Structure formats: C-alpha cells, structure tokens
Scaffold this motif. Structure first.
Motif, PDB file in Angstrom:
ATOM      1  N   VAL A 255       0.877  -1.203   0.000  1.00  0.00           N
ATOM      2  CA  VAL A 255       0.000   0.000   0.000  1.00  0.00           C
ATOM      3  C   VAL A 255       0.897   1.230   0.000  1.00  0.00           C
ATOM      4  O   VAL A 255       1.546   1.520   1.028  1.00  0.00           O
ATOM      5  N   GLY A 256       0.963   1.899  -1.144  1.00  0.00           N
ATOM      6  CA  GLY A 256       1.784   3.100  -1.299  1.00  0.00           C
ATOM      7  C   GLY A 256       1.208   4.281  -0.528  1.00  0.00           C
ATOM      8  O   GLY A 256       0.015   4.343  -0.227  1.00  0.00           O
ATOM      9  N   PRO A 257       2.052   5.259  -0.164  1.00  0.00           N
ATOM     10  CA  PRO A 257       1.548   6.506   0.403  1.00  0.00           C
ATOM     11  C   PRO A 257       0.698   7.251  -0.632  1.00  0.00           C
ATOM     12  O   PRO A 257       0.915   7.090  -1.836  1.00  0.00           O
ATOM     13  N   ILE A 258      -0.251   8.031  -0.125  1.00  0.00           N
ATOM     14  CA  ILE A 258      -1.137   8.920  -0.921  1.00  0.00           C
ATOM     15  C   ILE A 258      -0.668  10.356  -0.701  1.00  0.00           C
ATOM     16  O   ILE A 258      -0.676  10.806   0.458  1.00  0.00           O
ATOM     17  N   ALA A 259      -0.272  11.026  -1.776  1.00  0.00           N
ATOM     18  CA  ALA A 259       0.095  12.460  -1.777  1.00  0.00           C
ATOM     19  C   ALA A 259      -1.041  13.227  -2.455  1.00  0.00           C
ATOM     20  O   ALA A 259      -1.199  13.097  -3.682  1.00  0.00           O
ATOM     21  N   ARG A 260      -1.835  13.948  -1.673  1.00  0.00           N
ATOM     22  CA  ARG A 260      -3.022  14.680  -2.186  1.00  0.00           C
ATOM     23  C   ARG A 260      -2.586  16.035  -2.741  1.00  0.00           C
ATOM     24  O   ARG A 260      -3.327  16.602  -3.574  1.00  0.00           O
ATOM     25  N   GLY A 261      -1.418  16.509  -2.325  1.00  0.00           N
ATOM     26  CA  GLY A 261      -0.681  17.589  -3.013  1.00  0.00           C
ATOM     27  C   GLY A 261       0.808  17.342  -2.945  1.00  0.00           C
ATOM     28  O   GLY A 261       1.229  16.190  -3.129  1.00  0.00           O
ATOM     29  N   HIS A 262       1.595  18.361  -2.598  1.00  0.00           N
ATOM     30  CA  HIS A 262       3.074  18.258  -2.638  1.00  0.00           C
ATOM     31  C   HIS A 262       3.535  17.217  -1.615  1.00  0.00           C
ATOM     32  O   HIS A 262       2.903  17.103  -0.548  1.00  0.00           O
ATOM     33  N   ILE A 263       4.581  16.464  -1.937  1.00  0.00           N
ATOM     34  CA  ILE A 263       5.045  15.349  -1.066  1.00  0.00           C
ATOM     35  C   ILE A 263       5.812  15.921   0.129  1.00  0.00           C
ATOM     36  O   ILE A 263       6.336  17.050   0.065  1.00  0.00           O
ATOM     37  N   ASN A 264       5.904  15.124   1.181  1.00  0.00           N
ATOM     38  CA  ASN A 264       6.721  15.445   2.374  1.00  0.00           C
ATOM     39  C   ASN A 264       7.608  14.235   2.703  1.00  0.00           C
ATOM     40  O   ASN A 264       7.545  13.211   1.982  1.00  0.00           O
TER      41      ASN A 264
END
Length: 216
Positions: free
Chosen positions: A120-129
C-alpha cells in the motif's frame, strides 16, 4: 467453487512445467526478458525494464500497488484481481487489509506468477513530504523482505504511488531504484531478476535514464 487454501496448497507444489499445462492464456517467460546488461550491449545482470502488462509475467512474484482494503479496485490492482481469479480476493479478505508502507504475500492463483506481494503506497493529495518519501521506500523494503523470506528469485515492481496516489514520477523512481540497489548490494546471490514494470512513456524514459547510474 474452488477454496483458496486448497487451491494455494495444490499450486505451490507444482513445477513450472506442471503449471504451464493448465495456463488459461499466453504468458511472458522470465528468459524472454533481457537483463539491463543484455539490453545495453555486475548488478546489470540482476535488473530488467519491462513495458507491458505485469499479469502476463511468469515470475516468482508480481507486486500489486494495492489499496488499504487489499480487496482490489481499479487500474492494475483490478487487472491483477481479474487475471488471478476470485481466490485472490478470498485470500486477501483473510489478510484484513494492509497498512501504508507495509506488504503482505498471497498465492497468484490463475496468474503465471507464483505469488502476489500486495503493498500500500503513500497517498500524496498535493506536494510530497518526508513521510511520503519514507513510506514509499518502506513499500519497496517490506516487499523485498517478503521476497527474501519466501525464496522468490524473480520479482516485478510497478511504479508504486504514481498516478492517482499522486507521487511525482521522477522522485518516485529515485526512491524505487535507491531501495532496490541497496537491497541487491546485500541480497544479489538470492535473486535472478528484479523487473521494473514501466508502461507509461513518462516512467519508461525516467527508468531508462537512471538504470546505468544505479546498477553499472
């Protein structure tokens, strides 16, 4: 109705020759995929680029960029569920989901692939951190830990968290290649091939450029 535990026990006993006699459709044998070494004529012998449908690959494991439920859905996750047949959903239901940056292994059922590693990959809803970047690395590390533990000698990865999960394609590829390179440095004896599944032109061009940097 086939029952997943009985089907998994039956399939994992079978040799490649035995499995091929029951295949529903055409497949891509591992020895029809060139190493980066062979393509560009060392770890270059241990990695491949593949532009095609991951579900056709006759490998020890294909990696599913899954969602938290592990029940399937759209895109390639949906394609893997349809290709594997309903025993994959049945085994996934028993796993009770998967956390971001973690992975779980199932049988591949109707796939030519022996196993599916669901991550399960991370979800980036805008700019990544930094959390996105750590979580994406952890998907690759968790997946490769299951590769080691299950004597998997060939494994194919998709571009985890790219597209809808919003991870920009170039920074994703850097994390993917860094994580595989570091793991190969330690574990190269125990694998024959890590395949990067790079269908979209954008991903193919990114990986084509970076393979030499990482592996030669």
């Amino acid at each position: 109705k086939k029952v997943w535990r009985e089907e998994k026990e039956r399939l994992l006993k079978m040799t490649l020759e035995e499995r091929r006699k029951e295949y529903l459709r055409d497949y891509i044998p591992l020895n029809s995929i060139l190493s980066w070494k062979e393509e560009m004529k060392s770890l270059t012998e241990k990695v491949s680029l593949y532009r095609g449908d991951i579900t056709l690959l006759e490998v020890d494991a294909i990696v599913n960029a899954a969602n938290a439920s592990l029940l399937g859905g759209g895109g390639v996750d949906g394609c893997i569920h349809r290709a594997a047949g309903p025993c994959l959903l049945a085994e996934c239901r028993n796993l009770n989901g998967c956390d971001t940056g973690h992975a779980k292994i199932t049988c591949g059922y109707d796939l030519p692939a022996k196993y599916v590693i669901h991550t399960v990959g991370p979800i980036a809803r805008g700019h990544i951190n930094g959390s996105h970047k750590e979580d994406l690395a952890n998907c690759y590390k968790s997946s490769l830990k299951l590769v080691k533990e299950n004597n998997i000698r060939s494994v194919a990865f998709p571009c985890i968290s790219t597209g809808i999960y919003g991870f920009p394609n170039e920074p994703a590829a850097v994390i993917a290649l860094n994580t595989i390179k570091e793991w190969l440095a330690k574990n190269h004896h125990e694998v024959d091939r890590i395949i990067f599944c790079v269908f979209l032109e954008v991903d193919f061009k990114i990986y084509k450029k970076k393979m030499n940097e990482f592996f030669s």
